[PDB]
Ligand binder design. Structure first.
Ligand SMILES: [Mg+2]
Ligand SMILES: [Mg+2]
Ligand SMILES: [Mg+2]
Ligand SMILES: [Mg+2]
Lengths: 154, 153
DNA sequence: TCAGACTTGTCCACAGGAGTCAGA
DNA sequence: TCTGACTCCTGTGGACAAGTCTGA
């Protein structure tokens, strides 16, 4: 478990509240138990001109990747264990996205228990809904009621 | 001259580098000596549904204002003296806009000497170009060359 | 099977100016 | 004469999703 400097976390929190994104998704997964697959993503977006800034994040956080998409680049972290480690330390300093951060951590922690009963999996899918609600969601398709539709059918 | 807490300045620098803006403008003015005036602006933009965040920023900074326009709100500060003191303290923590901040500080400090010679004023307007060059400028009109043309009269 | 690397798409929520105006 | 408040606007540079595919 990596320990991060406080001044680094304080600046980064401000930058994340601004140009960052804490994302919780429910993805279609045919080769799956409940035909769905949870996905948690911490993301920092920046113009490719300033990709160097995102590249530094990979070294400073110790994990994650940088991908290009159009005229824009993104730092990307979805691996659960270091994500949980990173968000735990970052959370006390977030102002706009603190609740999204806490919800993701909660999803991550109660993740294996959710992969038992279909009811518990659906309860966490509602936690995912709340994250999307807190964000400025605009193109969401798969929700908890989408899961329930494929759940109450079988 | 107020002195800001370091943790506040560290978070703020992050949010400024992300959703904020450091703007230098050359505005036409028929009443002024060189037909152009300078305006420096510290800007923080956010959606109106989060105007409260900008409202807190007014209280914490202790100066500036919040304006609305559409579904988007803005904290802004153009008053030179508090701007200089604010940017002086924020500067060392900035990463993406550190240069813009230093140029604004430089412009402010050379403002009295700028109202003396046209060449020196052009030099200051040149510094305004650099800030715009550092920003993601897309709708800029009046530049130092605009001043050069007018000065040639 | 399944988390995790990586791509593509859309709609803004920003950034970064342009102006005008009152009062100093 | 001169500054700062204040409004309006463009053109993105973000945000927040949607997805494919693979290795063990
Ligand atoms: Mg933002
Ligand atoms: Mg919302
Ligand atoms: Mg930004
Ligand atoms: Mg530029």
């Amino acid at each position: 478990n990596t320990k991060y400097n406080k001044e680094f976390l304080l600046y980064l929190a401000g930058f994340v509240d601004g140009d960052g994104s804490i994302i919780a998704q429910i993805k279609p997964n045919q080769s799956g138990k409940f035909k769905h697959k949870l996905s948690l993503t911490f993301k920092v977006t920046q113009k490719t001109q300033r990709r160097w800034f995102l590249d530094k994040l990979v070294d400073e956080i110790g994990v994650g990747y940088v991908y290009d998409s159009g005229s824009v680049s993104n730092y990307y972290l979805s691996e659960i264990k270091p994500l949980h480690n990173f968000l735990t330390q970052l959370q006390p300093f977030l102002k706009l996205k603190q609740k999204q951060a806490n919800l993701v951590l909660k999803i991550i922690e109660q993740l294996p228990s959710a992969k038992e009963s279909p009811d518990k999996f659906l309860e966490v899918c509602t936690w995912v809904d709340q994250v999307a609600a807190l964000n400025d969601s605009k193109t969401r398709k798969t929700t908890s009621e989408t899961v329930r539709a494929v759940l109450d059918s079988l």
